[PDB]
Design a binder for this molecule. Structure first.
Ligand SMILES: Nc1ccc(-c2ccc3ncc4ccc(=O)n(-c5cccc(C(F)(F)F)c5)c4c3c2)cn1
Length: 1021
């Protein structure tokens, strides 16, 4: 453990060299203003400049870079020294990026607020975060209780040398050993047990004495126990070793008195590679409790696994579950690729330490990768024309096993499409050592693929160190700005690294050192990720490495933010206590502790670190009247240019779900305006600051549909009086609502009522609550409304209670958005998949991802999808239309009347078959069902099945594909009556069956025939 941690710490010290504090690029000391490249105007900008009372105000064209805008400003009053920052926000604009790229400018242009920038030199910029010379210079880090017990042991041995009273002295020796074991988590190695029993016997049995030699064996056995407990400090290759994988589970040490009270204990042993087990788990023998010094659970059972060491892949790990008291996991190869050998002491937690003895040969077995093939590589049509359809496939989910085997065979012909490599690697048949030569030699010549698509290669299914490393190598093509918004997926992807010092963690630390915003985001994500029981330890280690590398300035700022979070936590929790008028008083009394630490502590806002705070505005700060009792905190800005900071802070409810929902919506808007569709969406942030509590970005001049109801078109009219301004404010409503519609369906957020739908003064619509964000199955399976579009919301669409051209436009926008998200189904699925391990409710199963995919209809053509979504909108506006759309949506995502196939070897052969009688049925249609009498071989009692003439027709047509028409009997083809035709068809079908079961043995024993006569729900009663 600590040897792996030392290696990790060394590699961190190496990583710090490429980021010296002297380089301003890697260590600016300030946040950069996040930018999103938008496809396809001028606006007014006020730029503060040094020496002038009033800022310079002028119209600045958006296309122009920031550099030329600085040069434009310099005219009214060193080139590299001047930079532009946002007024009241400690975030600097990008130098070589256009103005309308930055989130702050685009937010300002959608909101319609004055752009306030400040031109200043790098010297004048606050850099309290900048990593100093001491930080860069310092080492990376993340008292001894047994020394005295060893001293006492050696002293008791020195006294034992006196032959006056040997027995006496030896007793105090043995007692010393007891205390040592008790201190070492209670671990008594069998070497010590045998050494103490040998000592007792060598003392009782009177150039060496028997007491001296047996005591020298004690010392040896204790120091060997220490070597194992600390786990600190002739080479055969792994693919040579033909030995079976085996180890000897010894005992669990330092057991509590409460355990002896559970009758018997046993372990379940599993071996896994890319997440899924390799073989059925192996149980251990059930044993009670053994006693020598302490109470233990002695097993001493060899466990052998049906594979050789050669077969073992590098990333293979051994799981031992205790009986579900605790689960331990051990990597069969260490971080240095040496195969686990000798005794191993594993740590388990309950409401403790497991000794596992691995074979310790004289020679150390190490694992090594195969050499590179270096082949470095003929086109054939039709098969190509078809293969292109399989590379066109959305993802690896929409692939049949036959498609996978066909794709893997035409492997080297897909070198012209890098983004399908996850489809190839998920279509790889085997993961054997000999086949790795081919795959690795392919990957090393494989052209780098889109970093968004490289997320897929970071899931558990692609847990090969070389694949992961290449994935991380290709990931270094994204902007930090694009990364930050994907960062949580990467934090959860750290779970699928068995070794601490992964490529992934190195990349994340590299990016965190290059950008404070990334480090800031990583901090809160790793903080909430510590709540994991298993990966807790790992996440502490990567967070500790981030803090130690981030410098004293950054870490001290984050420590400030942490205490601010904890104080506001305690305040918000005190409001849940009181439901009287007293509640409003408890805010001010609880504020004593909060405003006190603000004295000589300019803390940054955890939700938006660019904002700095001095103190609170008691008059402004109020509660929120719901069930969670959230608090809006109005903090005065430290920069007098900046406006007051309104932020919500919630306790009791889990925000992890909200965060994921909002990240999805943000990425939807991103990919929308990445193609040139700007549905002017409302993007509000949210930060899980701990355990079911965190900060929420507040939206000014916005209320829910309940508060507007108690007072819709009149609300917007109040804020936009002019009918000119009103129609322009309604245009915003159409675009925002459309974006909300496509987001609500595709995500499967169904629980849409007046309280979770919200509108702002400008007319932009946004959803706030995401309790059941991924509840797709509830919407599909049962009759939960996919989207709610109120008649009032239809009134807000230009034209009141009238068919309008603007509604057809709205539909066109909805359809265009739907298609644009359908093109990126894989990205959405990969993001959700990586966020499964978080333990978020409604995202636990792969089926949840499949449901999203089925709701996205990626196979369907854009035009057919637009028809589907238009008829969804038509529904949203009677119950009859809603139920019809429900039936067509269910039928779309989905022998006919018997899905499951059955053979005569399961149900039992048939002796006699006749059509007993015919029954008339009106439901669903006015048809005739026929009661077929079946007598099985050896069965006394006759069964019955009920089959309609259409269910017979299907069978005759199904059998005509395999068997010829001359071998099968003729099927019956107006006159008489409907009852007389049914009465004659009875006898004609009875003649057809008799002729079918006596034609030949191949026909009468076909699997379709058995299936046709198989019991179903229509047959049973
Ligand atoms: N899960 C959630 C719930 C609510 C919000 C949310 C976000 C921004 C707001 N911006 C402005 C306003 C203005 C008046 C206002 O009342 N709210 C608001 C709406 C619903 C619930 C609450 C709550 F009780 F939970 F605090 C507050 C809000 C806002 C509520 C975010 N996430």
């Amino acid at each position: 453990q600590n040897d792996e941690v030392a290696a990790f710490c060394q590699s961190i010290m190496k990583l710090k060299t490429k980021f010296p504090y002297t380089d301003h690029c890697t260590n600016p000391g300030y946040l950069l203003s996040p930018v999103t490249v938008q496809r396809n105007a001028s606006v007014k900008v006020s730029i503060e400049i040094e020496g002038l009372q009033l800022p310079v105000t002028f119209t600045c064209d958006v296309s122009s870079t920031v550099e030329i805008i600085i040069m434009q400003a310099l005219c009214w009053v060193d080139v590299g020294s001047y930079i532009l920052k946002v007024c009241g926000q400690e975030e600097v604009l990008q130098n070589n990026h256009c103005l309308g790229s930055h989130e702050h400018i685009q937010n300002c242009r959608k909101w319609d607020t004055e752009i306030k920038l400040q031109l200043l030199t790098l010297s004048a910029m606050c850099q309290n975060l900048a990593r100093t010379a001491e930080d860069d210079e310092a080492p990376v880090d993340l008292r001894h209780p047994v020394e005295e017990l060893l001293d006492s042991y050696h002293y008791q041995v020195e006294l034992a040398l006196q032959t006056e009273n040997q027995h006496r002295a030896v007793d105090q020796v043995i007692k010393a050993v007891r205390k040592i074991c008790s201190a070492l988590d209670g671990v008594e190695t069998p070497s010590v047990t045998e050494a103490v029993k040998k000592l007792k016997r060598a003392v009782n049995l009177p150039p060496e004495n028997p007491v001296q030699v047996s005591m020298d064996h004690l010392t040896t056995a204790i120091y060997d126990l220490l070597r194992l407990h600390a786990n600190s400090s002739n080479i055969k290759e792994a693919w040579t070793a033909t030995e079976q994988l085996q180890f000897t589970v010894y005992a669990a040490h330092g057991i509590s008195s409460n355990w002896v009270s559970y009758e018997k204990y046993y372990l379940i042993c599993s071996l896994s590679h890319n997440g899924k087990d390799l073989f059925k788990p192996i149980q251990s023998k059930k044993v009670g409790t053994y006693k020598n010094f302490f109470y233990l659970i002695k097993w001493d059972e060899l466990i052998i696994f049906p594979i050789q060491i050669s077969q073992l892949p590098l990333e293979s790990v051994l799981h031992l579950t205790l009986f579900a008291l605790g689960k331990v996991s051990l990597t069969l190869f260490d971080f240095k690729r040496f195969l686990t050998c000798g005794t191993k002491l594993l740590y388990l937690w309950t409401s403790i330490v497991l000794q596992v003895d691995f074979p310790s040969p004289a020679f150390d077995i190490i694992y090594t990768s195969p050499q590179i093939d270096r082949n470095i590589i003929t086109l054939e049509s039709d098969i190509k024309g078809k293969l292109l359809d399989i590379i066109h496939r959305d993802s690896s989910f929409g692939l049949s096993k036959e498609d996978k085997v066909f794709l893997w065979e035409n492997r080297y012909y897909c070198l012209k499409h890098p983004n399908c490599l996850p489809k190839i690697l998920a279509s790889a048949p085997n993961w054997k050592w000999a086949n790795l030569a081919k795959t690795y030699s392919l990957l090393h010549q494989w052209p780098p693929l889109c970093p968004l698509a490289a997320l897929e290669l970071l899931d558990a299914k692609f847990a090969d160190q070389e694949v992961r490393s290449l994935a991380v190598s290709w990931m270094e093509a994204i902007s930090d700005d694009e990364l930050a918004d994907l960062l949580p997926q990467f934090v959860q992807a750290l779970k699928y690294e068995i070794y601490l010092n992964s490529s992934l963690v190195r990349f994340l630390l590299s990016r965190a050192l290059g950008n404070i915003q990334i480090a800031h985001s990583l901090y809160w994500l790793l903080k909430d990720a510590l709540h994991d029981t298993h990966f807790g330890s790992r996440y502490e280690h990567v967070l500790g490495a981030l803090l130690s590398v981030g410098g004293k300035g950054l870490r001290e700022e984050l420590s400030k933010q942490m205490k601010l979070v904890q104080l506001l936590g305690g305040v918000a929790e005190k409001v849940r206590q009181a439901s009287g008028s007293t509640r409003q008083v408890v805010l001010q009394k609880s504020m004593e502790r909060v405003q006190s630490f603000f004295l000589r502590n300019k803390c940054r806002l955890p939700l938006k670190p660019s904002l700095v705070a001095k103190e609170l505005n008691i008059k402004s700060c109020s509660f929120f009247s719901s069930n969670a009792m959230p608090l809006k905190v109005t903090m005065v800005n430290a920069d007098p240019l900046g406006e007051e900071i309104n932020v919500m802070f919630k306790v009791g409810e889990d925000l992890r779900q909200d965060m994921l929902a909002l990240q999805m919506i943000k990425i939807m808007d991103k990919i929308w305006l990445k193609e040139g569709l700007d549905l002017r969406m409302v993007i509000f942030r949210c930060l899980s600051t701990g355990r079911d509590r965190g900060m929420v970005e507040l939206v000014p001049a916005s209320d829910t549909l309940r508060k507007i109801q108690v007072e819709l078109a009149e609300w917007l009219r109040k804020y936009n009086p002019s009918e000119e301004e009103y129609e322009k404010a309604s245009e915003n409503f159409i675009y925002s609502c459309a974006g909300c519609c496509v987001a609500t369906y595709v995500l499967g957020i169904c629980d849409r009522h007046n309280d979770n739908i919200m509108l702002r003064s400008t007319g932009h619509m946004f959803h706030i609550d995401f309790g059941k964000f991924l509840g797709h199955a509830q919407m599909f399976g049962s009759f939960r409304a996919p989207f709610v579009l109120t008649s009032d919301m239809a009134y807000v669409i230009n034209g009141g209670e009238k068919p309008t051209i603007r509604f057809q436009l709205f539909v066109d926008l909805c359809c265009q958005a739907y298609n644009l998200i359908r093109k990126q189904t894989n990205l959405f699925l990969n993001l959700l998949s990586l966020m499964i391990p978080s333990g978020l409710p409604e995202l636990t199963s792969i089926q949840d991802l499949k449901y999203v995919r089925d709701a996205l209809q990626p196979q369907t053509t854009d035009a057919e999808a637009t028809i589907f979504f238009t008829r969804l909108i038509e529904s949203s506006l009677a119950t009859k239309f809603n139920f019809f759309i429900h039936n067509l949506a269910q039928l779309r995502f989905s022998l006919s009347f018997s899905p499951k196939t059955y053979s005569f070897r399961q149900d039992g052969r048939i002796k006699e078959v006749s059509v007993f009688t015919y029954h008339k049925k009106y439901n669903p249609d006015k048809h005739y069902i026929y009661v077929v009498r079946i007598l099985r071989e050896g069965h006394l009692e006759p069964s019955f099945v009920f089959r309609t003439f259409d269910e017979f027709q299907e069978l005759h047509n199904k059998l005509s594909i395999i068997f010829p028409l001359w071998k099968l009997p003729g099927f019956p083809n107006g006159r008489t009556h409907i009852k007389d035709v049914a009465a004659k068809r009875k006898i004609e079908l009875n003649s057809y069956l008799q002729s079918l079961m006596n034609a030949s043995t191949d026909v009468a024993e076909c699997d379709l025939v058995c299936t046709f006569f198989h019991p179903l729900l229509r047959d049973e009663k």
